[PDB]
Amino acid sequence: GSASVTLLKNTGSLPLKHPQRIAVLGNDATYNVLGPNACGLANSACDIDNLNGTLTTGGGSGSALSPYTITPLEALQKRAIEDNAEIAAVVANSNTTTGAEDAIAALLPDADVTFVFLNRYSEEGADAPDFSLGGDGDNLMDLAVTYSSNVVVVIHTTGVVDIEKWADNPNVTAILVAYLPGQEAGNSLVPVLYGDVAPSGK
């Protein structure tokens, strides 16, 4: 994970120093709400709108079960606590959950950094129709750039996605792609974000 996470954009926001107020966005930052193995033997049987959490692997016969997932939020919070900082995550569906937009609007302005975790599930037996982000990713980004000027994007994905609407936004200070990191998702990522190891994936 640490050797592969790929830094695509950085205007000087990374590595992080010791930020004191940290905002997180996206269900990808936390657990599948039905459990890491809820989608079944092929990681492909959860409902179309289910919040699957961190995309640690793809769908179909080349997936596998997981004894746990070390979520980005957990790993970010651990480091926040070491710096005596505050951290808060909006991890619901930003379109369909009552109060989610307002919660994001109220959270992001005072944060020193805001992390948006995006994903794009794909699977055996079908091709992706386009490069569009999975779930509410488009809307998370739209909201993130509206309410914050230090947005750091992390993408867990099976392939290339469409970030054309935001990659040249002056409020997106950094972008990374972490691909499909397996069970150690958060703890492989956070040391790169905080500069313990320089990213080296390409």
Ligand X SMILES: *[C@@H]1O[C@H](CO)[C@@H](O[C@@H]2O[C@H](CO)[C@@H](O[C@H]3O[C@H](CO)[C@@H](O)[C@H](O[C@H]4O[C@H](CO)[C@@H](O)[C@H](O)[C@@H]4O[C@H]4O[C@H](CO)[C@@H](O)[C@H](O)[C@@H]4O[C@H]4O[C@H](CO)[C@@H](O)[C@H](O)[C@@H]4O)[C@@H]3O)[C@H](O)[C@H]2NC(C)=O)[C@H](O)[C@H]1NC(C)=O
Ligand Y SMILES: *[C@@H]1O[C@H](CO)[C@@H](O[C@@H]2O[C@H](CO)[C@@H](O)[C@H](O)[C@H]2NC(C)=O)[C@H](O)[C@H]1NC(C)=O
Ligand Z SMILES: *[C@@H]1O[C@H](CO)[C@@H](O)[C@H](O)[C@H]1NC(C)=O
CB of 43 to ligand Z, least distance (A): 27
**Torsion (CA) 96, 33, 3, 24 in degrees, nearest 10:** 50
SS3 content of the chain, % helix, strand, coil (to 5): 20, 20, 60
**In angstroms, what CA-CA distances link 11 with 5, 41, 60, 165?**
17, 42, 37, 18
Which string of x and - marks every residue 58-87 that binds a second copy (by CB under 8 A)? ---------xx----xx--x--xx--xxxx
Q: What is the closest distance, in whole angstroms, from the C-beta atom of residue 122 to ligand Y in the complex?
A: 6
Determine the interface stretch with a second copy among 26-34, 117-125, 135-143, 153-161 (rule: CB under 8 A): 26-34
C-alpha 16/C-alpha 107 separation (Å) is: 19
Q: Among 6, 10, 50, 149, which residue sits at the site for a second copy (rule: CB under 8 A)? A: 50
Find which of ligand Z, a second copy, ligand X, none residue 134 binds, CB within 5 to 8 Å per kind: ligand X
- Residue 124 in the binding site for ligand Y (CB under 6 A): no
CB 132, CB 161: distance < 8 Å: yes
Task: Kindly state whether residue 149 participates in binding ligand Z, applying the rule CB under 6 A.
Answer: yes
